Structures are given as C-alpha cells and as structure tokens.
Amino acid sequence: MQIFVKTLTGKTITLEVEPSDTIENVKAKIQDKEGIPPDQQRLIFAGKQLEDGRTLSDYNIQKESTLHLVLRLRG
Amino acid sequence: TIEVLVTVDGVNFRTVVLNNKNTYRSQLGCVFFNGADISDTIPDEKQNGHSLYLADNLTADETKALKELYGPVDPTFLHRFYSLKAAVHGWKMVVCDKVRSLKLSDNNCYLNAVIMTLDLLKDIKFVIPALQHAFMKHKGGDSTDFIALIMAYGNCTFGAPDDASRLLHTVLAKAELCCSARMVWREWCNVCGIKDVVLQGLKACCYVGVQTVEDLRARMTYVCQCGGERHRQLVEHTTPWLLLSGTPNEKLVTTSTAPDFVAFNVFQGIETAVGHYVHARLKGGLILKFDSGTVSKTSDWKCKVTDVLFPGQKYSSD
Ligand SMILES: [Zn+2]
C-alpha cells in the first residue's frame, strides 16, 4: 500500500509499504530516501508516537495515511 | 568447585554448580552479584552461599516469569537493566522548592524532564508489574529502580544525552488510566462520508503534533483512503489532564494573565547538537524553572517549549 511521510524539510515523500512492515522497517526506507539514521527518527501518526517493536497494522495505519518525521533531540 | 543460586525475578531461584575451570559466561552466562557484572570471573566463596542474577541463557520457566514480571522485552533487556541499575545508583532526588527533582549527573537532565512531568500526571498506573512496582517505589523516596527501568525500556544509554518527549511517550505507552477519559474525533470526506472515531483511556490525554489546545480543536486536513481531501476535528473531549507535545517552539511565556497550562518542558541550545532540558511549572503567579537540581523562580521566560501540560478537559462542538 501507499503511505506519506512529512519530512523535516517540509516536503512529502511517498513509500510503498505493507501492513506487516515494522516501524523500524519503515524507518529503514526513510533512511535510504532522506539520509537520516533510524536511531534519530521519530515517526508520529495522528498524535501517537510509533514505537519500534510494533507494525503499521498495529497502529491502524492504512493506505494514504500520513506519518510525521520528527528529529530525535539530544539533551 | 562451587554451588550458587540463579534468579531473574528475585523470587524463584535454581541451584547451579559451576566448575573453576571455566568462567560464568561459558558455564552459566551473564550474571550480576551484589549489583556487579561478574560474568567473566571464576567462582569464589562469598558467592558460594549467596545468589546471582542471570541475564541470558534463561530456562523455559525463567523466560515465563520474565514475561509476567517485565512483559515482552528485548533479548538484551535484562543485561542492560542490570548494568543501568548499577550505574544510576549514585544519582539522587533532591527537594527543590516543595517539589522533588533529579540531580544533574551523567547527562540526565532529559530524565529530569520526564520524571517531573510524570509526577504531575494524576490517576495513572502501569500494566507491567515490575514497572508499577518500581513506580510506587519511586513515589516513596527511592527511585533507583524506576529510573533504571524507563532507561531500559527507552533504550537509553548511561551518560548519553537523549530526548525527553520521546522517552515520556514511550513510557506512557506502557501506562494506563486509573480513571476514565474520552476523545471524539469527527472525520469526514466529501466522497466517502462522515465517520466519528472515539478514543478512550490514557490515549485520550496525550497528543503529539500540537502545543496549544486551540490547535488541537482546529480542523485538521489529510488524505483519505480514496485519495481525496479528508478532514478531522475534535468535537468531544474529557480528560483529567491534557499533555500536548511538539517540536521545540520559541514562545514568549509570561505570567501576566497566566495561560491555561500548569507546567511545561524546555529545550535549550541548538537541536542539531547537544542541548539541555529544563522542567518548568506554574506555582502562584510566577514561573518555576527546575534545572535538574535547581529552582529559578523568575516570572518571565523566552524559551523553546516542547511538552505542555494542561488541566482537565471538558469540550463540546456545540
Ligand atoms: Zn474519501
């Protein structure tokens, strides 16, 4: 299926993913496109932070859904 | 030859005999005696009467008890937790201006933001026993276990700086409400139709992406499954408290007519390098800046806010 990832630049990229794909798996694809390491990625979906262990179907993320990429801070 | 005990929960033990020809790692595995990694030494005498703490190569019954106690965890969760628990023993919780806080050490200012924010969340508990155990323990004056646990779950490394919001929401994802709260979203698409979505529990109290209640109630716009424009708007919301979180945003916080929120966290420095976290609350008519062991009580602040906590909610879309 198709999902959207609002990047840090402000642009929107498009990923082809499966419901069984883990959040980490998505972050890996984002890495190859944006050049951002999975460690420093925070994916947000409708106000919920996506924990690494889960999958897209777990968070009820279907086609045309929009994930938000937030940079991991260092305090 | 010696004979020692082995546990992973501090309740169920098993008697194990190890030879003095091979180390713990090759005979038994990763173990912690008296809070120290002895998994590369040779069996001695003061441990030939007391107990150890296994981390890897568990039994079917220990793995069973692990899931009951720690929930589903990383294969390295046990090792990291033992290591962290020993490392954070030196940390201390002070009492800065009738509020407790984590004293600055080994880049733990982000952890101060998390804990001090957690302490302001009413009616919450944890599904995982060990977590809830360490939580109630924390409420009473010893917070060593709790700190080490949330660091273990958030994959925090000792001494390394980290994200406070990220850790806070990872923690809350393993928590639940000891009361009730509802959140009603009205989604609609000109083609597909109107659909109401209800959120109930702790999930109704947290939202990442906005920092003002007004923006939470504003009509949001995204893409429907058909490809067309889809909309969403909060039309009903009742919570004991509302936690809004977003990217560091520079707001002009002034106590002159103090805004709706009770507390907020602040990221100082530049977000591409290593910065600093400061927890802030609203007591009286002045701001209270809690800097991991300090209490600046000035009444004005131009800062980059991150997490913003609001009181109970009660809203209807007329
Ligand atoms: Zn539609």
From Swiss-Prot, chain A:
Which species is this UniProt entry from? Homo sapiens
Q: What does this protein do?
A: Exists either covalently attached to another protein, or free (unanchored). When covalently bound, it is conjugated to target proteins via an isopeptide bond either as a monomer (monoubiquitin), a polymer linked via different Lys residues of the ubiquitin (polyubiquitin chains) or a linear polymer linked via the initiator Met of the ubiquitin (linear polyubiquitin chains).
Record site: Essential for function: 68
Compartment(s): Cytoplasm; Nucleus
List (Microbial infection) ADP-ribosylthreonine occurrences by residue.
66
Processing after translation: Phosphorylated at Ser-65 by PINK1 during mitophagy. Phosphorylated ubiquitin specifically binds and activates parkin (PRKN), triggering mitophagy. Phosphorylation does not affect E1-mediated E2 charging of ubiquitin but affects discharging of E2 enzymes to form polyubiquitin chains. It also affects deubiquitination by deubiquitinase enzymes such as USP30. Mono-ADP-ribosylated at the C-terminus by PARP9, a component of the PPAR9-DTX3L complex. ADP-ribosylation requires processing by E1 and E2 enzymes and prevents ubiquitin conjugation to substrates such as histones.
* Residues at the site labelled Interacts with activating enzyme: 54, 72
Positions carrying Phosphoserine = 65
Q: Which residues form a coiled coil?
A: none
Q: What is the effect of changing residue 65 to D?
A: Phosphomimetic mutant that binds and activates PRKN
Q: Which domain of life is it from?
A: Eukaryota
Q: Where is the Ubiquitin-like domain?
A: 1-75
Question: Glycyl lysine isopeptide (Lys-Gly) (interchain with G-Cter in ubiquitin) cross-link position in this chain?
Answer: 6, 11, 27, 29, 33, 48, 63
Protein name (Swiss-Prot/TrEMBL): Ubiquitin
Gene name, per UniProt, is UBA52
